Amino acid sequence: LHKNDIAINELMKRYCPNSVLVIIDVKPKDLGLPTEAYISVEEVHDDGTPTSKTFEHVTSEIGAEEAEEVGVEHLLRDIKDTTVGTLSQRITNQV
Amino acid sequence: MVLESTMVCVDNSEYMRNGDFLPTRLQAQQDAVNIVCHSKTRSNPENNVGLITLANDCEVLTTLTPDTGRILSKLHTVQPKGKITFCTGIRVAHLALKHRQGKNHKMRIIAFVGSPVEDNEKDLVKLAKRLKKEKVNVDIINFGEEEVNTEKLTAFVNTLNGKDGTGSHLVTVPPGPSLADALISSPILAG
Amino acid sequence: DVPGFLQQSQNSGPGQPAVWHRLEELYTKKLWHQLTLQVLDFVQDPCFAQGDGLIKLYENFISEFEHRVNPLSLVEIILHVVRQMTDPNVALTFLEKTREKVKSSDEAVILCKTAIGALKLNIGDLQVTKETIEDVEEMLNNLPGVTSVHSRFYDLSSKYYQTIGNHASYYKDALRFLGCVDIKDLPVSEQQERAFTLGLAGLLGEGVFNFGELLMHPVLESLRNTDRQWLIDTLYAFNSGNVERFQTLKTAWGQQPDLAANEAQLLRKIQLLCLMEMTFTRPANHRQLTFEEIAKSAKITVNEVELLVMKALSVGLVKGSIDEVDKRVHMTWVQPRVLDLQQIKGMKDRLEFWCTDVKSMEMLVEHQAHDILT
């Protein structure tokens, strides 16, 4: 996260309404959730530091509407669904 | 005709509104921008003109476009804040010259400076060395003054200007009742 | 009036022509900004404030019809005018005139109402001034967080602190004053009394329990090096807790006025300190405790500990509820607040142990799990 990002987001803070910032990685080596939703708001600091733009973490979920699930499932033919049973559960319980 | 890009920087400070010199000369140099962009329109209408200020926070009012129609409307609301900035004012233009449409167009950037430079000689000669390295045409225009006109600015221009043959020219305007239009129209850079 | 100004501009005191030379030079050059700068430099100088009554009005008029330079400077110099003349009667008319004269581009109304309120903070008006102060702090939540205006607002909250009405608000604003600190350029001689009344407000503050937050920032303890250490001693004693009542009794009888009636309240405030510290002391190894240590440290009987923990549950800083039948004391979640070194060591320790345990179990399980299942 660069310091200039507040100035970059300031433009859309002026012209447009409040903007949400998303940080991802260039190389998908991260096992965790690649997408982090950060809302831009001004919060009162307890220490007394001057008021500045603060990025607050917002929970998110990865999902599709209708056809995108079909497209992904067809293009992959690798990943498996929930499939309640032994292997599907024990894989999670392992990794 | 001639294929080149035009970048004009306007001074949004309050030093342009002073009562000694012209009565808010911002409108006068605005009219200058108008007549020179109309001149370029008459010569080569395919040229694009961008607009940005010299202030701390760099904000582009209008992206480079051959049509000055909406630009004339964007010439208003100068937002008279800040004082002056140099380095990032250069880096927000010369580095942004790669975002132009036509790749056959030459690189030309001018500036209107109505405030004293806060940067030392080091940053000046370094940035001049950079502009000389990437070889970009620069025309220095200063409206109004406080201290001596040209001291380190002379060596600044001399070090910044390469290719003595048909190269860049320096524009120095003294105090006077006459406007800045016919005065900046004197060199070959205008018209 | 420009040619007629030369007559009264030329004539001045013994030392005035020194600055009046540059003043009249910038006046002939007709530079408004440089004129304003020269004015501020003139005010900054320790003038005798005698024959300046003419130049104040002149620069006032000039600043009025110039409609160029920042009117805030005019606000400052007219505040110097109302400070020198001490005439609140025409002050309202002048301020209203300044508010009416300035057009609308950027909003100076916050500093204008700041000045109005500041001048109205005298014995003349109180309630309405507090109302318009609330208005002022409710004015701009926007980007100009420069806090300089809010620092002047902190001065207003100091003049409001002169009133015994609300102690807590001045401390909440004192946190902001603690966070808005820039540099040491301002006189330390003033910082003595500033940190003094800050110490008094912090001590008498009922909106805060632990004083460790005030001692947290290094600038205060760095600026208190010149001042006597009697305050730093008792503040650090309140920060690290008091196992002895002698010193806190000494600082209880240290300040005679207003500390007598609030003494018992301060005792009821610091009685929770030993509790939170003792429950934050041992994170493990039989958390279960008894009232013996509490009664020994707080030198109180066994009859008043019920009302003590009743007050503790009344504040709401502790969720502790003891289900005991036979004599016992159970403890619960508590806030670390300022800092602890042994709890940092214990933090890295318990964390390293937890981490290597989770890692060990993970590797141990996955060892056979990957082979026999996959």
Curated annotation (Swiss-Prot), chain A:
- Organism equals Homo sapiens (Human)
Q: What does this protein do?
A: Component of the 26S proteasome, a multiprotein complex involved in the ATP-dependent degradation of ubiquitinated proteins. This complex plays a key role in the maintenance of protein homeostasis by removing misfolded or damaged proteins, which could impair cellular functions, and by removing proteins whose functions are no longer required. Therefore, the proteasome participates in numerous cellular processes, including cell cycle progression, apoptosis, or DNA damage repair.
Q: Which domain of life is it from?
A: Eukaryota
Q: How does it assemble?
A: Component of the 19S proteasome regulatory particle complex. The 26S proteasome consists of a 20S core particle (CP) and two 19S regulatory subunits (RP). The regulatory particle is made of a lid composed of 9 subunits including PSMD7, a base containing 6 ATPases and few additional components. Within the complex, PSMD7 interacts with subunit PSMD4 through their respective MPN domain. Interacts with TRIM5.
- Cross-link Glycyl lysine isopeptide (Lys-Gly) (interchain with G-Cter in ubiquitin) residue location(s): K80
Q: Which residues of the full protein are shown?
A: 101 to 195 of 324
Q: What else is known?
A: Does not bind a metal ion.
Q: What is this protein called?
A: 26S proteasome non-ATPase regulatory subunit 7
What family name appears in the similarity comment?
Belongs to the peptidase M67A family.
Swiss-Prot record, chain B:
GO annotation, biological process: proteasome-mediated ubiquitin-dependent protein catabolic process
What GO annotations for molecular function exist for this entry?
A: identical protein binding; molecular adaptor activity; polyubiquitin modification-dependent protein binding; RNA binding
Q: Which residues cross the membrane?
A: none
Could you confirm whether the keyword Phosphoprotein appears in this record?
A: yes
Which residue numbers mark the cross-link Glycyl lysine isopeptide (Lys-Gly) (interchain with G-Cter in SUMO2) in this sequence? Answer: K122
What superkingdom does the record give?
Answer: Eukaryota
Keywords from UniProt, A to Z, are: Isopeptide bond, Phosphoprotein, Proteasome, Repeat, Ubl conjugation
Question: Gene Ontology cellular component?
Answer: cytosol; nucleoplasm; nucleus; proteasome accessory complex; proteasome complex; proteasome regulatory particle, base subcomplex
The VWFA domain covers which part of the protein?
5-188
* Record remark on domains: The 2 UIM motifs are involved in the binding to a multi-ubiquitin chain in a cooperative way.
The protein's job, in short, is: Component of the 26S proteasome, a multiprotein complex involved in the ATP-dependent degradation of ubiquitinated proteins. This complex plays a key role in the maintenance of protein homeostasis by removing misfolded or damaged proteins, which could impair cellular functions, and by removing proteins whose functions are no longer required. Therefore, the proteasome participates in numerous cellular processes, including cell cycle progression, apoptosis, or DNA damage repair.
Family note:
Belongs to the proteasome subunit S5A family.
Assembly and partners are described as:
Component of the 19S proteasome regulatory particle complex. The 26S proteasome consists of a 20S core particle (CP) and two 19S regulatory subunits (RP). The regulatory particle is made of a lid composed of 9 subunits, a base containing 6 ATPases and few additional components including PSMD4. Interacts with NUB1. Interacts with SQSTM1. Interacts with UBQLN4. Interacts with UBE3A. Interacts with UBQLN1 (via ubiquitin-like domain). Interacts with DDI2.
Name of the protein: 26S proteasome non-ATPase regulatory subunit 4
Report the portion of the entire protein shown: 1 to 191 of 377
Swiss-Prot record, chain C:
UniProt protein name: 26S proteasome non-ATPase regulatory subunit 13
Indicate the family of this protein: Belongs to the proteasome subunit S11 family.
Q: What is the residue range of the signal peptide feature?
A: none
An example GO biological process term is: ubiquitin-dependent protein catabolic process
Where is the PTM N6-acetyllysine found along the chain? K296
Respond yes or no to whether keyword Nucleotide-binding is given for this record.
Answer: no
Residues in PCI domain copies: 169-336
Subunit structure, briefly?
A: Component of the 19S proteasome regulatory particle complex. The 26S proteasome consists of a 20S core particle (CP) and two 19S regulatory subunits (RP). The regulatory particle is made of a lid composed of 9 subunits including PSMD13, a base containing 6 ATPases and few additional components.
Q: Which organism is it from?
A: Homo sapiens (Human)
* Disulfide-linked positions: none
Q: Cite the InterPro entries for this sequence.
A: PCI_dom (IPR000717), PSD13_N (IPR054179), PSMD13 (IPR035298), WH_DNA-bd_sf (IPR036390)
Query: What SMART domains does the annotation carry?
Result: PINT (SM00088)
Record's keyword annotation contains Ribosomal protein:
no
Q: What is a GO molecular function of this protein?
A: structural molecule activity
Gene Ontology terms, cellular component aspect?
A: cytosol; extracellular region; ficolin-1-rich granule lumen; membrane; nucleoplasm; nucleus; proteasome accessory complex; proteasome complex
Keyword vocabulary terms for this entry = Acetylation, Proteasome
* A Pfam family the protein falls into: PCI
